[PDB]
Amino acid sequence: MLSQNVAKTTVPSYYMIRTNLPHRKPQNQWEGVYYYSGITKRQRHLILLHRKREREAHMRSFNISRASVLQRLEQLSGDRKQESLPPHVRLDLAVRLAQHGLYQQATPIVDELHHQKALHAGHYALLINALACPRLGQRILHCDAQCDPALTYKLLGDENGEERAQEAYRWFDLALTSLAVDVPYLPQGTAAASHITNALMRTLLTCGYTHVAAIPDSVYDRMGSMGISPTISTYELVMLALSLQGNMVEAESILSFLRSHHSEHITVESFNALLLGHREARQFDCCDAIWQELVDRRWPRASPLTAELYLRSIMDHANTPTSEPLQSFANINVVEKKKVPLVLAQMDELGVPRTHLSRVLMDEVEDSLRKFQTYRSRFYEWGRAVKQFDFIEFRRRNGWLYDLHLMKCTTKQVGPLRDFNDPDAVQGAVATAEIPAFFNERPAWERPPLEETLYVTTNKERYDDVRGGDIYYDDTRGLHDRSPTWMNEVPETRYDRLYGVNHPDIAKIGIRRHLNVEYVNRKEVVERDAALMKKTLSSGRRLRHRVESSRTHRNAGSL
Amino acid sequence: TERNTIHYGVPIQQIVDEFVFRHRNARGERPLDYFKPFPNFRALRLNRMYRDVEGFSLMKQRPEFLEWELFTRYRQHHQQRRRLALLHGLEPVANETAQERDTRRHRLDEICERTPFDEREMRVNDDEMRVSVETLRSWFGVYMLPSPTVVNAV
Amino acid sequence: THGLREKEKHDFTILQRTVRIPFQGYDMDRFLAQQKGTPYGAQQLPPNVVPS
Amino acid sequence: NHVVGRAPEPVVPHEQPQEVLRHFSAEERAMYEQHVKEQTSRQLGEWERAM
Amino acid sequence: PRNLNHALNYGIANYAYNRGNYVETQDSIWEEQTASGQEGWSPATHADGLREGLPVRARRPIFSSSAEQRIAGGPQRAVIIQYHHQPFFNPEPRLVKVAFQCDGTIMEVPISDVMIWQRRYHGPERTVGDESRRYNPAAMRRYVDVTDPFNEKTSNTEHFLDKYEPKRNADTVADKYRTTKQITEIDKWTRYDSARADNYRPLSI
Amino acid sequence: ANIPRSVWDPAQHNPNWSDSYGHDITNRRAWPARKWTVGLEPCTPREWLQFSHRNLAYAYNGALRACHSLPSMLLLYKEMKQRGVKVD
Amino acid sequence: AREEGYVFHHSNSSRFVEETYRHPGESLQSRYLALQPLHTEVSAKEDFQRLYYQAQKHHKQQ
Amino acid sequence: QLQAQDRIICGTHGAGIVAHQAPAADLSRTKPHEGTGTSERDPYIRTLHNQRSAAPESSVSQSHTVNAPTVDECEMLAERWGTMNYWHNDTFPRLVVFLK
């Protein structure tokens, strides 16, 4: 039984033959054709289960890699013991430990290598890069960050970023000292120094917010003071540092400088850095502008990561809700998903592979495609009767028929307003519109309280001859309404003896008195307290004797 | 993180329409030129104060007499100065320096001193009175509208 | 829930009919400073209040 | 003409009126006065250094 | 410190120019607008206030028999001798007659080949300078003469016919004061105005 | 990117965008046709067909003849010259 | 640089200078007129490699 | 060229035409598009957009407006391309400085 299924057609009679009233609603041109773009519960469950399976497989791979590196470290130490071993073995072991995040074991190996003087500039760069934990970053990207590079950078900080940042700074200082032993400018300006600085910035990118904020204003300025010539990688890393913190005013200006003075040196990564910054700063219009600039350039050769960043930005903008005045109707930001097929076509033209996108993003991409990517062959048939009526049947089965042109018949009407300018003239309607009824509502202050829980209202139809009036009228009964003679229609109980008393002393009829032997009344307690409070002010004055003290001596009297 | 919910503010056009509808055409706030036979769009919108009045301190907050006409003459003088700069190729550049702007202003002042004023381009707004340059000089003094002889003497 | 907040909002809308645009002044900064009392010679002594 | 190189008004941040200074405690009042005097002293000193 | 020029305007905000100097103040406003890009050379349009003696920068055409089509050139300063807004006086592609001040030559160039100095970004007339209007306290107490709203019938320079007009009581009683009407009573608000649709594009109704 | 920035950003506000209730009132007005006493301003194409500056000279001649005083004739002549009608 | 106050800003039409105002000699102009600025134009970029290259052959020449 | 445009239009919830002047709630989590109507900074209806404010794109083309010759442009002046108007413009011709 459903309360929405009502009688669309009138009871058969001779009016249907002797009157010109149409027997069907005229077609609504603005209401679009009903098409199928939903997901069933089992399909969603299967998608979630498969994502969990792939994520646990990636976690298992990370675990076996950690076990392998730990076993190698232990067996290497035990086997070597007193016997000397080549420095490169310990160097690669430390690199692997750092890449897997085992900085605790990585530090002593690097310290002893530096004391042995077997580490060079390239090896220092390797160690500093390994401190960033690329393997842990990949694992967390697949498992926790949901393949979101921004979330990877945001979550790698919590993996003891500050301690690793301090260790990286110490390694950079000792690397500079070990590089100085290779006239007043050689240690400062050289390729190795710039490479080491780039490595330091790269490993600081994965630390906490404090270090990523300190990169562009402390590390860059210190490099400038030392006099180390920066590189395109340095500019990329400082751009990424500025973008992760949402400060795009400077991230745009630095790229402008790169395009002006150091053109034909900008690589792809600048565009994804700007895209990431705009996505973090909720500047999707500027993100779209940068994507269009990239697709017009075509030389930076937009990466799968760049395409994924732009798609994620547009989908986040699609899911962002608007304010209430724009939310009175259906949400308007869902239109942003219509741009996805355009982006996919542009990726086909640019040669960016479609499969390189993360599967988490691909699920939502396929959702938006099934919502806004109908082909011409299926467009030739989606307009029929069977499909629309099947959609109607599905809506009826799910009990949602409030937004269907065919199955909804409206009965409520709104009358005119009597203008006080000239009330003599009467007004007649000249058209009819299906206004959604929140345009002209009763203002709240002349409405019963919330009108929903206190009162239950049902809009039914009179069975008597209307002869003109509201054929469909609503009844408004209170939720707590009961029959006026409910007392004798319900079985008699213990409370019948309290008939008519305004404030009965329920404690006398109470049941707890007999079960508890230490009974005491809060009413008696407060009565005693009030009596004591009255006694406080019921003290009274006292007749006080006075003795003259005009003279020098204070007169003293006895009893 | 407060930008997750996008809040499109009410447009300025919507605000102006609501204000004028509430005020029933806002006859007081509309200019006097609006009530003329064929007003152009410039004299159609509202009476917001623009940046033309900046720099003129003769009238602090209420021009008592002829100060508005003097200000109109001054702003038309500056309009003609701008026109002369445009003709002679002394337009401001986006990235001028101090030693550029001062010299450019000096050259423009040379041109302005050597170029006569054009009285035909003067126009009268709503409720304004036409006053001759001779009348303005006699009232406020010749230094307000100096002859080139007065300029070089100063 | 009673909607008195909406009532006061509608009352504000009603008063918006009666209100008018203030005269911001020819020189905006000069007028604002004159209100603030910052510029030289524009300081106004606070009104004298009868003591209790 | 009246002012040529004179210092500007030493505007103090978080300036409170008497209606707020009434509820300040004794040490709170002393702290506020110390803040005001330090601020105005710094303003005058920087103006002197600039002049 | 930034308060070096506070002595120039004590209390009011510090400025890097002379507020008392009106022409310098307007010039500095011009400088800041050109720096912010709100003013500059933009391609001309018909709706812009093209007229006689309007400073525009147009590309000099080069005349060559080898080229079937017109040849463009360097954009340099020019003065508009005349420009007919009438389509029957300059059909597509419409031309504007210009004089190049570098040598003095007079030519006709297409409107798309003319660059004009804008003052704003949205205005239909980007070349006409903005005009400020005097503030009136008695906003609703203004009056307009329906007979001569523009005061075009003013005496201006006195002539020998004026002296013969005799002042009398009937002359003193002015028909101008009879014809003068109030701005409030000039217009009437109607139900069409109350139900007027939006001329712009609404965001959400 | 769907709703253009130019309709909700106050920075891109159109300085000279008139309101919806102003231009219609501006063009609705029909000013009185008696700008000058002698002639009537034409408001319809038929009145324009009848109207001519040369023809106004005949009515001004008649009114000038009806005038009995030289100052009144001078005032009417000033009105005629301000209108710019033909003098014969 | 950050401590003394500096941010990344660069556009197509951008220039970089060192700013010093002309010293106001005691007169009417100094008393009343605003100070005249003085901008010495400098490069927006500094090439450490070319600076070191210049110094390298500026040293051994001596 | 409206005066005080940033403060009036982009800074005031009333756009300069709304006069903002039961008690207001003490600790209220008001909706993003509303307020308690206590002062200008807390109007009944908020007008300023929550998103960023961007000035309209300039309608002046920089490809035809020659700028001042920067000291940084001089080094690459021998290695830079320009049109004949760029080389021989009325203000700051670049061929002269290239020869100098």
Side-chain angles (χ1 to χ4, degrees), chain E residues 170-182:
Chain E
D171 192 9
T172 279
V173 177
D175 56 337
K176 312 295 295 180
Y177 300 155
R178 302 160 55 91
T179 57
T180 307
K181 304 190 63 180
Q182 183 147 347

Side-chain angles (χ1 to χ4, degrees), chain D residues 4 6-9 46-47 50, chain E residues 1 3-8 10:
Chain D
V4 181
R6 310 302 180 88
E9 269 293 338
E46 62 86 12
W47 178 257
Chain E
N3 51 19
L4 249 57
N5 297 271
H6 88 89
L8 264 294
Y10 202 86

Side-chain angles (χ1 to χ4, degrees), chain A residues 285 317 332 335-336, chain F residues 1-3 5 8:
Chain A
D285 49 68
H317 182 233
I332 66 179
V335 71
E336 302 293 338
Chain F
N2 183 272
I3 296 182
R5 180 173 290 275
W8 58 276

Side-chain angles (χ1 to χ4, degrees), chain G:
Chain G
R2 205 281 303 176
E3 299 152 3
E4 58 187 330
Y6 280 102
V7 295
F8 289 95
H9 195 200
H10 179 93
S11 63
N12 180 27
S13 63
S14 178
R15 291 183 74 175
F16 293 74
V17 297
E18 172 187 355
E19 176 195 31
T20 49
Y21 66 87
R22 196 180 317 276
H23 175 261
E26 174 55 38
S27 62
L28 303 171
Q29 301 83 351
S30 63
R31 191 175 299 99
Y32 308 110
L33 291 180
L35 321 100
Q36 303 86 11
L38 187 144
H39 309 154
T40 62
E41 178 78 15
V42 298
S43 176
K45 51 180 291 301
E46 42 194 14
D47 33 14
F48 300 152
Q49 297 298 333
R50 278 169 58 181
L51 269 45
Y52 299 154
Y53 165 81
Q54 293 295 339
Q56 186 164 338
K57 27 223 56 187
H58 182 51
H59 204 179
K60 52 174 168 293
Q61 266 293 88
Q62 307 174 2

Side-chain angles (χ1 to χ4, degrees), chain A residues 365-393:
Chain A
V365 162
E366 290 184 357
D367 184 19
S368 53
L369 286 180
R370 94 165 70 85
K371 293 178 64 176
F372 298 94
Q373 206 241 8
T374 297
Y375 298 94
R376 187 180 303 274
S377 60
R378 306 206 290 260
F379 178 85
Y380 275 119
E381 202 74 12
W382 79 325
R384 255 196 167 275
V386 207
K387 307 178 179 183
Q388 319 307 320
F389 293 152
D390 183 21
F391 186 83
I392 292 293
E393 288 280 348

